[PDB]
Design a protein around this nucleic acid. Sequence first.
RNA 1: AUACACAUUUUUUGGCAGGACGGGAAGAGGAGACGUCGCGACCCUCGCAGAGUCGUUCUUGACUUGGUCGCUUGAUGUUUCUUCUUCCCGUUC
Lengths: 73, 73, 237, 65, 82, 170, 92, 72, 77, 44, 84, 75
Amino acid sequence: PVNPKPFLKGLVNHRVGVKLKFNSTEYRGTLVSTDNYFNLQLNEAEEFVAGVSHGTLGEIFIRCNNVLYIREL
Amino acid sequence: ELEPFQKNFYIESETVSSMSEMEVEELRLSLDNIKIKGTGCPKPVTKWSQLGLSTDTMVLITKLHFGSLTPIQ
Amino acid sequence: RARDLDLNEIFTRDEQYGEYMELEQFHSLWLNVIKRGDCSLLQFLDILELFLDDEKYLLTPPMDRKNDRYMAFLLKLSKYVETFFFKSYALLDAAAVENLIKSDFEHSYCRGSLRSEAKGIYCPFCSRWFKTSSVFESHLVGKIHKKNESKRRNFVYSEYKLHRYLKYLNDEFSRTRSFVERKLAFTANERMAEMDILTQKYEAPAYDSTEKEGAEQVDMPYWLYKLHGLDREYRCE
Amino acid sequence: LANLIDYKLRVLTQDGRVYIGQLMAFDKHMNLVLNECIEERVPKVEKRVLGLTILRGEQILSTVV
Amino acid sequence: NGIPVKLLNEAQGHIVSLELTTGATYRGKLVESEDSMNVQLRDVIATEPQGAVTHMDQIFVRGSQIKFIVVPDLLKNAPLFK
Amino acid sequence: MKFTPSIVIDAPQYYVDHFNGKYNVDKCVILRDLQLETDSESMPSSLKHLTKPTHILDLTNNDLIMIPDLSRRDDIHTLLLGRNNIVEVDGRLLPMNVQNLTLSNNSIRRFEDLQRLRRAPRTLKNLTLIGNQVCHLANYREHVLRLVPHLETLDFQNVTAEERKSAMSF
Amino acid sequence: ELEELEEFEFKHGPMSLINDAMVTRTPVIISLRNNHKIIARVKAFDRHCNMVLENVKELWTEKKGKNVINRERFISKLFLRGDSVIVVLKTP
Amino acid sequence: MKLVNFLKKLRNEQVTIELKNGTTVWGTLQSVSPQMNAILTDVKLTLPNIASLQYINIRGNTIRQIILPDSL
Amino acid sequence: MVPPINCIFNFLQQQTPVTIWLFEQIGIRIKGKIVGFDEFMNVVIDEAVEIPVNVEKGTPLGKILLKGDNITLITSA
Amino acid sequence: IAENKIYKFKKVKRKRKQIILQQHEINIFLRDYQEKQQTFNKIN
Amino acid sequence: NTLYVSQLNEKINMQRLRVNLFLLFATFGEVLKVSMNFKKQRGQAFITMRTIDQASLAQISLNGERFFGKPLKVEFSKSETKTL
Amino acid sequence: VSTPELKKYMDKKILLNINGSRKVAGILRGYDIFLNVVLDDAMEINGEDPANNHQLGLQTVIRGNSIISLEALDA
RNA sequence: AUACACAUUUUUUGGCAGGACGGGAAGAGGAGACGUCGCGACCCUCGCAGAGUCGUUCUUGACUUGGUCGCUUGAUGUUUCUUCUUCCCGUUC
């Protein structure tokens, strides 16, 4: 079975973007690491609010709980 | 397998840490010509309050020791 | 006569009945009036020190003295310092002090009390200097100074009070700053025990059941005794 | 919390409603059983007599004597 | 287990009133109460926050969804006074 | 003798029947926030140590002359004044939300003495004067209704629009 | 052994941002659920992202009867719950 | 380690707790439970006009943040 | 009369297009094929699309890991 | 001042809370006094 | 300690009846009863009193008192109240 | 972990009300410790008035954490 | 005298977004549902007991299971739509 954890491990070291439940914020950056509780670390992050670039944040941590989904870009 | 422990309890006060090296040399000469040997010696203090001791201790000391800190102190 | 008199309803625990004055709160508010966090408790106290000087708080202001947030803050703080002052020295005639300060304010402060050999005479209300006393006087009737003295009067006066009351409390200011540095240089256990002490001092009877009334002052053969046979106590029946 | 037992207590709910009643027992989740408990909403206005109630610790905000 | 859970298990067979996180009120005879507060209820009269009232035969609501219950005063005697 | 805080601290303090809360007043005498009964209260005073937690005040069986000297008490809803000698009422009473007043068996003589009860805004719903000389005077009921229409139940009788209108007619 | 693996996973995981923050005493900015933000230095952290923060400057956004204004205040010693954290950003 | 223990150290400390609901609390910590349930005395409380309360217990999960003295 | 995990497993094998109803969100729902899942009901969903109901449009997202907490109701289309 | 004496006898040092207390008590006392002095001036 | 009253205007709601009864009978002593158990009104209220002398005094002094239009009839209860 | 005593409800048509003011009707198939439910012949009752047969025989799954309450249509 | 309390039902979250004031009345250009608890009564109804039974002992353990009409201008939330003047009574300066 291909589990979310192996898919995500393969997604590490790749450009991703993560849409939070709020959808008020999306984050596009390289996926540095993710833990067993699925908190997210991204680098070079860029914030897309309402589909527009808000700014370039850089090395960023995302609380697992806020994550709606993650997609590869 | 020895138990690790803390030995550094010193927080250099801002007023002391602001002192330049020339200032520190001068302070040592003025304090009965204090001479040091060894690497990394912290700067001398000139007041009991630059040592971060509780008020109890402060009251107690003064009480315990009357007048200015000695050069050795 | 005063059986329901309670100091704890006048002094907070951090003030220790006049030992210290609690300025952390004002660091929160005052510090925020700057819209940043570059300001530490100690740097804030460093700011307050300006008001011990007769000219610094006027010519080297933390913020622009025409800023709203700033003037409001200064008001609140001033009020605090004054109430603290009279709170910690009940025995002195409050009205006397008040009137003294007010008269000093009217007769000197607003009359070109601040003078420089170079720039001349400074005005608290317009924040400008003046060549000679002549132009200074004919400026105190101008529409500008009328406007300002008519709008920023309360603030100027409050600033002044903060000044003189902080001067009268120099010993308490220093005492507290010291306290700050101490607590700051504590560890966890230390800070905790100290807090315990302040607390106990706060919630303790003003008179202990264990106080004094009328205690006025004026103005070898070590091995030999074992050898002797006292290793085993002997007895005659 | 054990000291508060049997007292009349005021709990504030998650929805802003205020409940008042005797605290008979608690548990780990902070589920409370309140005897002769009544509800006040706005401050008396909109007061109702509920009687014996359990409240869930997930909903409870705070309690006061 | 929780002492209030023990009471709520004593409440079985009685008529109770339930308010859920939505605010609807279900009054009726409690069949069964699990440890997780999941409750099975009979002959329920329901009053909505709008004021509308309905009748339903059997209802079972999740524990987590319940704001609070009111149980009869008969139980108040004992043995929770200890 | 006097109602003083030392007395305020330690009377039988508990919750009314009605679950109305309070904390009572008896070091040796007269009480407050519960059972102010039978300790010869001359003048009400020192209500401040009550410090607000009281729904009810059972003043009955004291020697109270008038009802003034009430600090601002938001919580007090019910006053049980029975078996005193209340001749007059203060006027600036205005303890907001005083819903119930029990003047039973006192010595209020005149209609005009009742006037101060009108000040009770819309909270004084229940008032009982029965046992006073003023009750005997003519058109007592109608004058109380026209004076304090806030009352919903007078002398444990309910107002009713009929005698409201008669009170308007006179 | 179990403790070791936990600390290690913490070290090479996403937490590495807050670990790095405490060791370098670097400022980080925290987007919270209150729509307030906290820029501060990390004194201590926890698995729940409970934190002790020093030199706190919180920025926020308020609406009035005219243009939106940002408001900010300084809190020197601030302890923070771990569920309020939406995001912790580490930046130069 | 566990910061909740760090809160357990905080008895007899005067603090201002902001809560997730926005409520401001000011008072002296009598104790905090490991749940971070905080019991305080001499509390002035501002709901989002201050109510003064002898004792207040708060459920830990509701606590947004607690502001400690800078002297700590 | 089958446990939901086995239901999801037959979605996995059949590779049917799946529509998820999210939590507290009527406006948008997500759709795509289930290539895998875990015990926390986090699902890798391929050729996923966001479907705002408010005729319906949507955004193609490609491969997605959707967290199980959002999941309200998993279906087939 | 130091020896805490007024003439010959050096008195026991008191703690701050008590000193302040008594100072506020003396404060209210002086208030009473000022009041009485006033009414007296208005009666004499 | 408990007095049984009857012959009262049942048209009064339960809570107002109880508050007026507690009010009226507080003049003789503390009333311990919080609420009418009988939940049937029609006068049949029981009033529980902490001391017995207050019960006797209330009985003798308030016989046939006009209360909500009707002269109340007061007697001693047949049994002791559960709270006593 | 406790298992909900839902056996009495098995193979009965039920009206589930779910968060977001959603309501579905269907025959109770399976359940688990988690209160997650399989519903056959599921029908969504939209807020308007119409209803859509989402899972006539294909069956749906509802997360127990989203299940507000469940009404038995049958006895 | 001798470990744990962040992965579905609870606590590590789906949350966020002379002047002014009140009241009461009148005169001119706030009202309609749908509920839930009250002032009166031409009415209903008519009485001492959480209730009802038993074993053993001077007091306990088991087993079963206000309602209606008005308001003659009572109080309260969902939910749609669109103030002035005069007189009286309270607070403040």
